Design a protein around this ligand. Sequence first.
Ligand SMILES: [Cl-]
Ligand code: NA
Length: 129
Amino acid sequence: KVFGRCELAAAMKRHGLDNYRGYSLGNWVCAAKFESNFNTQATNRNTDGSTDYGILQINSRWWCNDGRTPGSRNLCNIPCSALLSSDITASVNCAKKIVSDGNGMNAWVAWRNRCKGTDVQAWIRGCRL
Ligand SMILES: [Cl-]
Ligand code: NA
């Protein structure tokens, strides 16, 4: 599923991400834009043999089991394919763990490089939330 900006903003808010660990909703929307272009089906292989899955590109090195990432962890206790559903529940629940790992949203290098320090309000402008 390719979400619209406001559709994703609404879903993320419903699932408790607005101000989660102090990160406003626009941060999460911005992160999803640059991680996946709002596409739940997005997958991308990392140089180390892990893969990133879903709207927030969650990495199999640490967070989910994809059956092909040796010597990795599954801290969200899920198959990575669950992170590709039209329904973002699994991605959101796992993201809540990630953002608590010590680095906050810096865990998403695309957030740090493209969203951090921006007028993130722009991402939810116009949306009826
Ligand atoms: Cl933080
Ligand atoms: Na894993």
